[PDB]
Amino acid sequence: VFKKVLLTGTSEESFTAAADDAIDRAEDTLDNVVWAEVVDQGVEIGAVEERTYQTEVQVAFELD
Amino acid sequence: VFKKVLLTGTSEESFTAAADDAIDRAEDTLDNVVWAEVVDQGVEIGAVEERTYQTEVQVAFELD
Amino acid sequence: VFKKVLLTGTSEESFTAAADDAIDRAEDTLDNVVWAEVVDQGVEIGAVEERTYQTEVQVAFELD
Amino acid sequence: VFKKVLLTGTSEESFTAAADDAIDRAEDTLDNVVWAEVVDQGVEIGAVEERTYQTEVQVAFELD
Amino acid sequence: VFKKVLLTGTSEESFTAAADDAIDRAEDTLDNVVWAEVVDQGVEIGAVEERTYQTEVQVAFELD
Amino acid sequence: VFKKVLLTGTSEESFTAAADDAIDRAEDTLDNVVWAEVVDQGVEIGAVEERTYQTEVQVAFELD
Amino acid sequence: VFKKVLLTGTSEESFTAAADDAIDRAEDTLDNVVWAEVVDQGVEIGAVEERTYQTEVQVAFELD
Amino acid sequence: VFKKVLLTGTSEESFTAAADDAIDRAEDTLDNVVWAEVVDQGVEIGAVEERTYQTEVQVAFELD
Amino acid sequence: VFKKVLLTGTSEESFTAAADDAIDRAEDTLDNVVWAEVVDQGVEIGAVEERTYQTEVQVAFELD
Amino acid sequence: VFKKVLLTGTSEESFTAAADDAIDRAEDTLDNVVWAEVVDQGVEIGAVEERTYQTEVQVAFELD
Amino acid sequence: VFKKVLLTGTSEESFTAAADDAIDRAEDTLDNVVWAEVVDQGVEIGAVEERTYQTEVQVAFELD
Amino acid sequence: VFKKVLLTGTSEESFTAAADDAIDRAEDTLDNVVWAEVVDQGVEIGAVEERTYQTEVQVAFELD
Ligand SMILES: Cc1cc2nc3c(=O)[nH]c(=O)nc-3n(C)c2cc1C
Ligand SMILES: Cc1cc2nc3c(=O)[nH]c(=O)nc-3n(C)c2cc1C
Ligand SMILES: Cc1cc2nc3c(=O)[nH]c(=O)nc-3n(C)c2cc1C
Ligand SMILES: Cc1cc2nc3c(=O)[nH]c(=O)nc-3n(C)c2cc1C
Ligand SMILES: Cc1cc2nc3c(=O)[nH]c(=O)nc-3n(C)c2cc1C
Ligand SMILES: Cc1cc2nc3c(=O)[nH]c(=O)nc-3n(C)c2cc1C
Ligand SMILES: Cc1cc2nc3c(=O)[nH]c(=O)nc-3n(C)c2cc1C
Ligand SMILES: Cc1cc2nc3c(=O)[nH]c(=O)nc-3n(C)c2cc1C
Ligand SMILES: Cc1cc2nc3c(=O)[nH]c(=O)nc-3n(C)c2cc1C
Ligand SMILES: Cc1cc2nc3c(=O)[nH]c(=O)nc-3n(C)c2cc1C
Ligand SMILES: Cc1cc2nc3c(=O)[nH]c(=O)nc-3n(C)c2cc1C
Ligand SMILES: Cc1cc2nc3c(=O)[nH]c(=O)nc-3n(C)c2cc1C
Ligand SMILES: [Cl-]
Ligand SMILES: [Cl-]
Ligand SMILES: [Cl-]
Ligand SMILES: [Cl-]
Ligand SMILES: [Mg+2]
Ligand SMILES: [Mg+2]
Ligand SMILES: [Mg+2]
Ligand SMILES: [Mg+2]
Ligand SMILES: [Mg+2]
Ligand SMILES: [Mg+2]
Ligand SMILES: [Mg+2]
Ligand SMILES: [Mg+2]
Ligand SMILES: [Mg+2]
Ligand SMILES: [Mg+2]
Ligand SMILES: [Mg+2]
Ligand SMILES: [Mg+2]
Ligand SMILES: [Mg+2]
Ligand SMILES: [Mg+2]
Ligand SMILES: [Mg+2]
Ligand SMILES: [Mg+2]
Ligand SMILES: [Mg+2]
Ligand SMILES: [Mg+2]
Ligand SMILES: [Mg+2]
Ligand SMILES: [Mg+2]
Ligand SMILES: [Mg+2]
Ligand SMILES: [Mg+2]
Ligand SMILES: [Mg+2]
Ligand SMILES: [Mg+2]
Ligand code: NA
Ligand code: NA
Ligand code: NA
Ligand code: NA
């Protein structure tokens, strides 16, 4: 059985690096992370000093 | 990093109050709740005494 | 077996009340109405004296 | 010919009132506003003192 | 309030049995599982000895 | 001209048998049923003794 | 309250004429037909002597 | 950079002519119109003397 | 077994004729073409002398 | 690099067996078939002696 | 109230830089730009000397 | 007439480079490649030594 968690990563550099930021967090706390699916991308402008790229991913991990 | 949980709130009064019911539950158990996105709305009729409005939300919270 | 009918309710008050208007009509004419799913919401402006909120629902009822 | 503008209204009270807030703004600046279609709903939590309901609408107006 | 978890079940037999595999896992660890919605179906071929059917479900459970 | 009706079939056995349950009902009451399109699948758990598979179909029939 | 019926019109000439074929049928049998929304378009080739254009519409009519 | 405006053209003749009606209006007021994407089609019936076909397009134009 | 190919037809006349242009090409090179599904429509303006209507279709053909 | 082909399998027995029918055909003619994604399901009724289940899949294969 | 404009940025380097190109243009002409949502990505090949990455964004700005 | 092929490119570096990997393969084997549309993005983790970014594109080419 796989389970997915819905995470938004952030980066001041790129959409790829924002995806990595989410996956990094998943790997910090979960075993057997197997893949990620991109489900949204965006850019935060008004709330930050530098533009911040965001990539939202479903991160899949194998249970048991 | 943000994470989202997928919650359906209920209310005998309105779709807005059903959204609040979900967000209230998230705030009971999670720190740093930052926003919610409505993803579905519905009305339960046959299983209840009074019509019950339901609003399903992805509730986003900031990790760490 | 359930069947659904696709109804747009209207209200001069709210999206919740517009959903109720559709469900009310379904219950006038159908037995065993069990739930409704919201599929669209809108506001009529140019054709009416007062803004009219509209909520379109699939209203499900149990056959037999 | 109709044209649409994509507006997000806000309210501390309800999704219906947030839709009205957008339509009000459109009517301040545009002639012949004829209808609105709801395209998204959400709730701002972390950036505000009170929860703020948001309703995004395509507001249609007749040209010429 | 209901909450959903996003699970992919697997089976060497059928899409129905793959859905059951996910629901079984949810019932092992959660109380008050109430329904599941199918959100994707697929077949793993290259990574397995026998074709493996997969059915991804949002499994809903009642909180509290 | 074709017309479609939106039916949810049920089965304690499989998603295929749930689709058949809907189509069977359509054929009981309608002439010239020509095809069905699957539009949703789900599993009822909390309201039933045995898990019940549900398959929602648009059932198309030829008018006249 | 509005209700919609889901009809596929056909024409050997065009997608516009296929939409008209559906609307014509609705007006034969229903009072107060008010609008139609196109939801799919296609072309039947193998089952017919001449290519047949098909346009599927939700035809809305006002109840009461 | 391209920008798009969301226009609904109308015609008493066809969906193609309704698309042209929108594009014509864009070309009246904008320089460097480069393409259009159809996003919806419909037919107005109750508000008009003759059926009126409508085609909604995102009309893209090059800035600068 | 059916297979589909994803073709964009073009016409200086209409969306229907653009669909035909794609289907014509499929029939030039494939046996047993059975139907087509419209998946997108658009208009090329900047790259052409005359507006060019485009209709993208999945063209289905029976294998073997 | 992976490539996908869009195939509709058929079966007089089940949606799972219809998916297998498509994958079987892909494996007859292609090397390195790695997975399939279900994209539609349906039932043919009017054109056949027995109901025929159909499952449409994108079948992915590795190039080179 | 927020308003969105629908812009396609371009870059010979990356999808991230194409998003920035759109946002840059918005900030040239608009006050209070607050965020952007990615809605499409593509690559122009035939019309250009070098491949050109394109990222289409809804750029949101606060009115008043 | 344009035709599209559905390709998933891969890269250990970025989503942009994964798109290029697919387009490169198309240009190896096809004449008159004209554009690509991004349709999905993902990251392979469990099956590889280094995270592998994947970008799925419809690559369009002009026939004849
Ligand atoms: C992708 C994205 C979407 C957003 N949407 C909203 C919104 O709907 N309302 C809001 O007050 N702020 C937003 N913000 C700040 C956003 C920010 C980003 C990066
Ligand atoms: C929005 C909504 C959707 C529902 N869908 C189903 C369903 O598919 N099958 C079912 O047995 N009960 C339902 N029920 C009870 C529902 C109830 C609600 C409120
Ligand atoms: C949600 C909504 C959508 C509508 N769409 C259209 C349309 O496409 N064309 C039209 O002539 N009138 C409309 N009207 C009047 C509308 C009215 C509402 C309330
Ligand atoms: C509906 C909604 C969506 C939002 N999405 C985002 C987002 O993607 N990223 C972000 O930094 N802030 C958001 N914010 C603050 C949002 C706020 C709202 C109300
Ligand atoms: C439904 C399904 C989808 C898949 N998608 C991918 C993919 O995008 N990339 C990949 O390397 N492997 C996959 N695999 C292995 C898949 C496997 C299945 C069963
Ligand atoms: C597919 C499916 C969806 C459902 N959705 C809901 C829902 O939204 N709310 C609810 O009270 N019950 C449901 N129920 C009971 C459901 C049941 C099924 C089988
Ligand atoms: C738009 C369209 C879609 C169709 N889809 C199918 C299908 O999925 N299976 C089938 O046996 N026949 C079809 N047929 C015959 C079709 C025919 C048309 C016109
Ligand atoms: C495509 C289309 C959609 C429409 N939708 C609505 C609606 O939702 N409510 C309404 O009062 N009128 C409409 N009208 C009048 C419409 C008219 C058209 C042509
Ligand atoms: C439907 C359609 C869509 C198009 N999209 C784009 C695009 O995204 N970028 C571009 O440079 N050119 C386009 N072009 C030229 C287009 C042309 C048409 C006809
Ligand atoms: C899933 C499915 C869809 C279909 N759609 C159509 C259609 O749109 N028009 C038609 O003449 N026949 C169809 N047919 C025969 C179909 C058959 C199937 C099995
Ligand atoms: C994303 C994208 C989509 C496009 N779509 C089309 C199209 O549909 N027709 C066309 O003539 N050119 C296009 N072009 C040139 C395109 C170009 C791009 C970059
Ligand atoms: C985007 C993506 C999606 C995937 N989906 C699946 C899946 O559904 N099942 C599976 O066994 N493996 C997958 N895999 C390995 C995937 C891999 C990727 C990169
Ligand atoms: Cl989710
Ligand atoms: Cl429907
Ligand atoms: Cl828009
Ligand atoms: Cl495809
Ligand atoms: Mg930096
Ligand atoms: Mg988002
Ligand atoms: Mg009360
Ligand atoms: Mg729901
Ligand atoms: Mg009042
Ligand atoms: Mg509507
Ligand atoms: Mg207050
Ligand atoms: Mg939004
Ligand atoms: Mg076995
Ligand atoms: Mg999947
Ligand atoms: Mg049994
Ligand atoms: Mg459902
Ligand atoms: Mg003729
Ligand atoms: Mg169809
Ligand atoms: Mg005339
Ligand atoms: Mg519309
Ligand atoms: Mg001419
Ligand atoms: Mg297109
Ligand atoms: Mg048999
Ligand atoms: Mg289909
Ligand atoms: Mg360079
Ligand atoms: Mg695009
Ligand atoms: Mg490297
Ligand atoms: Mg994918
Ligand atoms: Na989730
Ligand atoms: Na817009
Ligand atoms: Na219907
Ligand atoms: Na394809």
Side-chain angles (χ1 to χ4, degrees):
Chain A
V1 181
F2 305 100
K3 178 173 187 189
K4 285 169 182 177
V5 288
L6 182 57
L7 298 178
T8 299
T10 71
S11 170
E12 294 171 12
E13 307 308 328
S14 68
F15 295 125
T16 295
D20 278 337
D21 180 62
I23 295 163
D24 283 352
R25 187 59 165 85
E27 288 184 332
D28 284 339
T29 55
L30 301 166
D31 270 70
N32 313 314
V33 169
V34 286
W35 77 83
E37 305 179 33
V38 175
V39 297
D40 255 327
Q41 293 166 295
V43 186
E44 176 57 70
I45 304 156
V48 289
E49 303 192 282
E50 241 219 308
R51 269 179 211 173
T52 296
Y53 309 97
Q54 297 187 351
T55 296
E56 183 177 44
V57 277
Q58 291 280 15
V59 183
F61 52 106
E62 197 160 16
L63 295 178
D64 277 67
Chain B
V1 181
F2 305 100
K3 178 173 187 189
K4 285 169 182 177
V5 288
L6 182 57
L7 298 178
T8 299
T10 71
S11 170
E12 294 171 12
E13 307 309 328
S14 68
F15 295 125
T16 295
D20 278 337
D21 180 62
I23 295 163
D24 283 352
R25 187 59 165 85
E27 288 184 332
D28 284 339
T29 55
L30 301 166
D31 270 70
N32 313 314
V33 169
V34 286
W35 77 83
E37 305 179 33
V38 175
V39 297
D40 255 327
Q41 293 166 295
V43 186
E44 176 57 70
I45 304 156
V48 289
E49 303 192 282
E50 241 219 308
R51 269 179 211 173
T52 296
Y53 309 97
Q54 297 187 351
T55 296
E56 183 177 44
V57 277
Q58 291 280 15
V59 183
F61 52 106
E62 197 160 16
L63 295 178
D64 277 67
Chain C
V1 181
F2 305 100
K3 178 173 187 189
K4 285 169 182 177
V5 288
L6 182 57
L7 298 178
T8 299
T10 71
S11 170
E12 294 171 12
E13 307 309 328
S14 68
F15 295 125
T16 295
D20 278 337
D21 180 62
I23 295 163
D24 283 352
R25 187 59 165 85
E27 288 184 332
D28 284 339
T29 55
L30 301 166
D31 270 70
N32 313 314
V33 169
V34 286
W35 77 83
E37 305 179 33
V38 175
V39 297
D40 255 327
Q41 293 166 295
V43 186
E44 176 57 70
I45 304 156
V48 289
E49 303 192 282
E50 241 219 308
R51 269 179 211 173
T52 296
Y53 309 97
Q54 297 187 351
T55 296
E56 183 177 44
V57 277
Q58 291 280 15
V59 183
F61 52 106
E62 197 160 16
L63 295 178
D64 277 67
Chain D
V1 181
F2 305 100
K3 178 173 187 189
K4 285 169 182 177
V5 288
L6 182 57
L7 298 178
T8 299
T10 71
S11 170
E12 294 171 12
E13 307 309 328
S14 68
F15 295 125
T16 295
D20 278 337
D21 180 62
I23 295 163
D24 283 352
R25 187 59 165 85
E27 288 184 332
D28 284 339
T29 55
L30 301 166
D31 270 70
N32 313 314
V33 169
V34 286
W35 77 83
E37 305 179 33
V38 175
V39 297
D40 255 327
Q41 293 166 295
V43 186
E44 176 57 70
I45 304 156
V48 289
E49 303 192 282
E50 241 219 308
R51 269 179 211 173
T52 296
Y53 309 97
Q54 297 187 351
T55 296
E56 183 177 44
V57 277
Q58 291 280 15
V59 183
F61 52 106
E62 197 160 16
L63 295 178
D64 277 67
Chain E
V1 181
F2 305 100
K3 178 173 187 189
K4 285 169 182 177
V5 288
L6 182 57
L7 298 178
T8 299
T10 71
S11 170
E12 294 171 12
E13 307 308 328
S14 68
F15 295 125
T16 295
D20 278 337
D21 180 62
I23 295 163
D24 283 352
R25 187 59 165 85
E27 288 184 332
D28 284 339
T29 55
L30 301 166
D31 270 70
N32 313 314
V33 169
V34 286
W35 77 83
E37 305 179 33
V38 175
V39 297
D40 255 327
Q41 293 166 295
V43 186
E44 176 57 70
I45 304 156
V48 289
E49 303 192 282
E50 241 219 308
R51 269 179 211 173
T52 296
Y53 309 97
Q54 297 187 351
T55 296
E56 183 177 44
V57 277
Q58 291 280 15
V59 183
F61 52 106
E62 197 160 16
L63 295 178
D64 277 67
Chain F
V1 181
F2 305 100
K3 178 173 187 189
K4 285 169 182 177
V5 288
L6 182 57
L7 298 178
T8 299
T10 71
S11 170
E12 294 171 12
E13 307 309 328
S14 68
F15 295 125
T16 295
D20 278 337
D21 180 62
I23 295 163
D24 283 352
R25 187 59 165 85
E27 288 184 332
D28 284 339
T29 55
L30 301 166
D31 270 70
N32 313 314
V33 169
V34 286
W35 77 83
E37 305 179 33
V38 175
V39 297
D40 255 327
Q41 293 166 295
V43 186
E44 176 57 70
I45 304 156
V48 289
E49 303 192 282
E50 241 219 308
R51 269 179 211 173
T52 296
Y53 309 97
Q54 297 187 351
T55 296
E56 183 177 44
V57 277
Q58 291 280 15
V59 183
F61 52 106
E62 197 160 16
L63 295 178
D64 277 67
Chain G
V1 181
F2 305 100
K3 178 173 187 189
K4 285 169 182 177
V5 288
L6 182 57
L7 298 178
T8 299
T10 71
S11 170
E12 294 171 12
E13 307 308 328
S14 68
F15 295 125
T16 295
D20 278 337
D21 180 62
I23 295 163
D24 283 352
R25 187 59 165 85
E27 288 184 332
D28 284 339
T29 55
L30 301 166
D31 270 70
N32 313 314
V33 169
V34 286
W35 77 83
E37 305 179 33
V38 175
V39 297
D40 255 327
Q41 293 166 295
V43 186
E44 176 57 70
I45 304 156
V48 289
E49 303 192 282
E50 241 219 308
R51 269 179 211 173
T52 296
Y53 309 97
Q54 297 187 351
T55 296
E56 183 177 44
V57 277
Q58 291 280 15
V59 183
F61 52 106
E62 197 160 16
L63 295 178
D64 277 67
Chain H
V1 181
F2 305 100
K3 178 173 187 189
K4 285 169 182 177
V5 288
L6 182 57
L7 298 178
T8 299
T10 71
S11 170
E12 294 171 12
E13 307 308 328
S14 68
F15 295 125
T16 295
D20 278 337
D21 180 62
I23 295 163
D24 283 352
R25 187 59 165 85
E27 288 184 332
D28 284 339
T29 55
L30 301 166
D31 270 70
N32 313 314
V33 169
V34 286
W35 77 83
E37 305 179 33
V38 175
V39 297
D40 255 327
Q41 293 166 295
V43 186
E44 176 57 70
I45 304 156
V48 289
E49 303 192 282
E50 241 219 308
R51 269 179 211 173
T52 296
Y53 309 97
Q54 297 187 351
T55 296
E56 183 177 44
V57 277
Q58 291 280 15
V59 183
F61 52 106
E62 197 160 16
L63 295 178
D64 277 67
Chain I
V1 181
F2 305 100
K3 178 173 187 189
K4 285 169 182 177
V5 288
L6 182 57
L7 298 178
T8 299
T10 71
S11 170
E12 294 171 12
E13 307 309 328
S14 68
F15 295 125
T16 295
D20 278 337
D21 180 62
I23 295 163
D24 283 352
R25 187 59 165 85
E27 288 184 332
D28 284 339
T29 55
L30 301 166
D31 270 70
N32 313 314
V33 169
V34 286
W35 77 83
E37 305 179 33
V38 175
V39 297
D40 255 327
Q41 293 166 295
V43 186
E44 176 57 70
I45 304 156
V48 289
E49 303 192 282
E50 241 219 308
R51 269 179 211 173
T52 296
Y53 309 97
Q54 297 187 351
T55 296
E56 183 177 44
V57 277
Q58 291 280 15
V59 183
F61 52 106
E62 197 160 16
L63 295 178
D64 277 67
Chain J
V1 181
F2 305 100
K3 178 173 187 189
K4 285 169 182 177
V5 288
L6 182 57
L7 298 178
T8 299
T10 71
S11 170
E12 294 171 12
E13 307 309 328
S14 68
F15 295 125
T16 295
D20 278 337
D21 180 62
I23 295 163
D24 283 352
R25 187 59 165 85
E27 288 184 332
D28 284 339
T29 55
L30 301 166
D31 270 70
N32 313 314
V33 169
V34 286
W35 77 83
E37 305 179 33
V38 175
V39 297
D40 255 327
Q41 293 166 295
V43 186
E44 176 57 70
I45 304 156
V48 289
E49 303 192 282
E50 241 219 308
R51 269 179 211 173
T52 296
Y53 309 97
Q54 297 187 351
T55 296
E56 183 177 44
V57 277
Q58 291 280 15
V59 183
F61 52 106
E62 197 160 16
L63 295 178
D64 277 67
Chain K
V1 181
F2 305 100
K3 178 173 187 189
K4 285 169 182 177
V5 288
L6 182 57
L7 298 178
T8 299
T10 71
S11 170
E12 294 171 12
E13 307 309 328
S14 68
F15 295 125
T16 295
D20 278 337
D21 180 62
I23 295 163
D24 283 352
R25 187 59 165 85
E27 288 184 332
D28 284 339
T29 55
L30 301 166
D31 270 70
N32 313 314
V33 169
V34 286
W35 77 83
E37 305 179 33
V38 175
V39 297
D40 255 327
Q41 293 166 295
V43 186
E44 176 57 70
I45 304 156
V48 289
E49 303 192 282
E50 241 219 308
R51 269 179 211 173
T52 296
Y53 309 97
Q54 297 187 351
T55 296
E56 183 177 44
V57 277
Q58 291 280 15
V59 183
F61 52 106
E62 197 160 16
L63 295 178
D64 277 67
Chain L
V1 181
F2 305 100
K3 178 173 187 189
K4 285 169 182 177
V5 288
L6 182 57
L7 298 178
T8 299
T10 71
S11 170
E12 294 171 12
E13 307 309 328
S14 68
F15 295 125
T16 295
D20 278 337
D21 180 62
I23 295 163
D24 283 352
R25 187 59 165 85
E27 288 184 332
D28 284 339
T29 55
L30 301 166
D31 270 70
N32 313 314
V33 169
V34 286
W35 77 83
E37 305 179 33
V38 175
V39 297
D40 255 327
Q41 293 166 295
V43 186
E44 176 57 70
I45 304 156
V48 289
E49 303 192 282
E50 241 219 308
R51 269 179 211 173
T52 296
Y53 309 97
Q54 297 187 351
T55 296
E56 183 177 44
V57 277
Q58 291 280 15
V59 183
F61 52 106
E62 197 160 16
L63 295 178
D64 277 67

